Design a protein around this ligand. Sequence first.
Ligand SMILES: CS(=O)(=O)Cc1c(Cl)cccc1Cl
Ligand SMILES: CS(=O)(=O)Cc1c(Cl)cccc1Cl
Lengths: 325, 325
Amino acid sequence: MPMQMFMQVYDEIQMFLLEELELKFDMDPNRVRYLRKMMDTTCLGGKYNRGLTVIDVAESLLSLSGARRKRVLHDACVCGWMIEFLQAHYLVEDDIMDPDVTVQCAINDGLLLKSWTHMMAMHFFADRPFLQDLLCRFNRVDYTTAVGQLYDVTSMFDFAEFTLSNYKRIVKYKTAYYTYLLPLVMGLIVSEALPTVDMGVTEELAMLMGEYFQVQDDVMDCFTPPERLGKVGTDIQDAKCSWLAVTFLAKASSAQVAEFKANYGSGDSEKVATVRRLYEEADLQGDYVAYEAAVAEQVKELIEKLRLCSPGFAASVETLWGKTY
Amino acid sequence: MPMQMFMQVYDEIQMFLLEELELKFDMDPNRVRYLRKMMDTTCLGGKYNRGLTVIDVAESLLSLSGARRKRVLHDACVCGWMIEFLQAHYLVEDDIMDPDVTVQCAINDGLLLKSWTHMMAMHFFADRPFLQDLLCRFNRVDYTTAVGQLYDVTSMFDFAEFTLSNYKRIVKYKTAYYTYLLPLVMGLIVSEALPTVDMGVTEELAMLMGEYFQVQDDVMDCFTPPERLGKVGTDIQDAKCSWLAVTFLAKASSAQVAEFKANYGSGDSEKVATVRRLYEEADLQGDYVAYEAAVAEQVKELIEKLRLCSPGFAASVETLWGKTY
Ligand SMILES: CS(=O)(=O)Cc1c(Cl)cccc1Cl
Ligand SMILES: CS(=O)(=O)Cc1c(Cl)cccc1Cl
């Protein structure tokens, strides 16, 4: 029912955007079918973890607070695809980072995917009293993500910023705000119960779950094989400010740090294996278990504090944390 | 006074955006000075033709309709920089079209410049009753520009689309909407006199002035030397759907079209000179004078129709047309 409704609204959103281009933007059918194939390629295929979270938060606030039910659920599906389209926009920009027409189309695809989030919001929420507040919070979170990408890209240019506090700043702005906090806020806006929750505890939970999610991703990028991870890990070659790097530099000797700096950020297969050897000898995978356990305790405690004022809203956060844990 | 006030508001807009990153986004001073230098590089240096147009439209509607004067003029300066920041966003995306950190920073700069238009609007217009209507029209024009870039990039991929009607469609969506129509609408919104004008005649004037502006740019790209144009013309090498191409294909013989197709879209210095020779022998620079004269007559006539219901608003359009002519 949730996934089936989320994909049914996708056909409604896609049909409007493509017909709007045909009727109001004078687009030929050849480009309409081109943009339909591009939209399905970039937006469909994922697990829809961000989009379905908006649905799970909305369905809890309407039953635990009937023409209003069908509207709130449909509004959450549109907001769910706004984030999925936004995620597709970020992924397209990442492919460009790593008269050529394929690059011109990639840049154009990234602009259309972002603008489509505004077009589907200005239409399905044209008469909603929260249209102005939704666009402002959506644009501020998108601006937050762009700032987080500046922290991540320039994390090794200005190992001084290879600290645990700066790592949290990267995860917070680059990932946690739009992946965990944005779906929760959008579920509150479509349910008209936004000021009825403690945003401080809600924001604190979103940053902890994103931190828990990024630490697990950093370890799998280095140790999980490519066929079992789904991609090729490249954090060591790209000199990323990963959780393994900032934790190794804290418990390593002067020679181990010198050997780390002489091998980190290189594409050599032996230098990357040297960095993995330093991570293995430092027992970082043992500290990874203890670090994630402490974060999980902080999540289980803040949900109860959020439950004292948001009983149903905390039930969706546990489900959100359940799929992260 | 106009230019001096427009640059004074720039310092106010820049100071807010940078302090917001320092106070609300936890940005270190090294990156704040980095973003200050990037903002001045991408946004400053141009002629500010789009930004100053918003000021000229606003000052006419307040004197030809005193604490309201200072607010409307300041609101027009913020809207003027929203377009200038938007133009800088488009230019940065064009540089990308033609672990590399310089490309990651270029993509990040393009995202920040676009988001800065929303941040400066959500702040200086936070209590304005037109904040929701301004963002929707701004996002729709930005979406219009992205669609126009799809028409321009794919103008030779799908010489069938090398027609005068499709050329007008490219100029309309790619350039005319955000360069000529957007500054006029923003001048009406800050003056609270938007529904007091004929938008049909206003839109028709914006597309004609943009068409008049693009035809002149296409001829200068081919004939004006690099030192006198400010850049190197490359429409022939890039196989662009220029006004010279769509006009040549209409008045050329079968061999001249065959010679055109065998030389258009190539970087060879002799093939580009062959295309220029075909343009010279077809007397296209003679038709360019007659085509621009007919467009100028249509502009001078629609301003009078717009004057019958918008006396002062048409005075700024003549000034807008005066700098285009
Ligand atoms: C979108 S994500 O990166 O997969 C994080 C996530 C997960 Cl893992 C499970 C449910 C919701 C979310 Cl937001
Ligand atoms: C921004 S532009 O491309 O220079 C077109 C223009 C001109 Cl030429 C003169 C005044 C206003 C405008 Cl919008």
